[PDB]
Amino acid sequence: EVTCEPGTTFKDKCNTCRCGSDGKSAACTLKACPQ
């Protein structure tokens, strides 16, 4: 459940989520995040 355009990414929880190409998906570096 992402909310962004493809080619913009942004800051999420404890990592950055690169908006996929469908405008509704994200990669998110995903390294760690206790809260």
mmCIF file of C-alpha atoms in Angstrom:
data_model
loop_
_atom_site.group_PDB
_atom_site.id
_atom_site.type_symbol
_atom_site.label_atom_id
_atom_site.label_comp_id
_atom_site.label_asym_id
_atom_site.label_seq_id
_atom_site.Cartn_x
_atom_site.Cartn_y
_atom_site.Cartn_z
ATOM 1 C CA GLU A 1 0.000 0.000 0.000
ATOM 2 C CA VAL A 2 2.199 2.892 -1.204
ATOM 3 C CA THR A 3 1.172 6.483 -2.015
ATOM 4 C CA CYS A 4 3.636 8.108 -4.444
ATOM 5 C CA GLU A 5 4.485 8.573 -8.138
ATOM 6 C CA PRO A 6 6.988 6.428 -10.026
ATOM 7 C CA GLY A 7 10.319 8.300 -9.980
ATOM 8 C CA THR A 8 10.163 10.287 -6.712
ATOM 9 C CA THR A 9 10.783 7.980 -3.700
ATOM 10 C CA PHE A 10 10.804 9.621 -0.244
ATOM 11 C CA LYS A 11 11.637 9.118 3.455
ATOM 12 C CA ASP A 12 9.802 6.253 5.195
ATOM 13 C CA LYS A 13 9.963 4.963 8.813
ATOM 14 C CA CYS A 14 13.727 4.310 9.155
ATOM 15 C CA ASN A 15 14.548 3.984 5.436
ATOM 16 C CA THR A 16 13.838 5.441 1.973
ATOM 17 C CA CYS A 17 11.145 3.901 -0.237
ATOM 18 C CA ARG A 18 11.673 4.303 -4.003
ATOM 19 C CA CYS A 19 8.203 4.559 -5.592
ATOM 20 C CA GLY A 20 7.967 1.655 -8.072
ATOM 21 C CA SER A 21 6.732 2.228 -11.643
ATOM 22 C CA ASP A 22 3.063 1.447 -10.905
ATOM 23 C CA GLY A 23 2.691 4.533 -8.690
ATOM 24 C CA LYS A 24 1.597 2.184 -5.872
ATOM 25 C CA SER A 25 4.696 0.095 -5.062
ATOM 26 C CA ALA A 26 7.959 0.881 -3.229
ATOM 27 C CA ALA A 27 11.323 -0.842 -2.647
ATOM 28 C CA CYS A 28 12.317 0.681 0.697
ATOM 29 C CA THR A 29 16.015 0.020 1.425
ATOM 30 C CA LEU A 30 14.798 -1.930 4.485
ATOM 31 C CA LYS A 31 17.794 -2.205 6.843
ATOM 32 C CA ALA A 32 16.338 -1.798 10.352
ATOM 33 C CA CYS A 33 13.621 0.104 12.255
ATOM 34 C CA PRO A 34 12.517 -0.562 15.833
ATOM 35 C CA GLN A 35 9.840 2.159 15.552
#
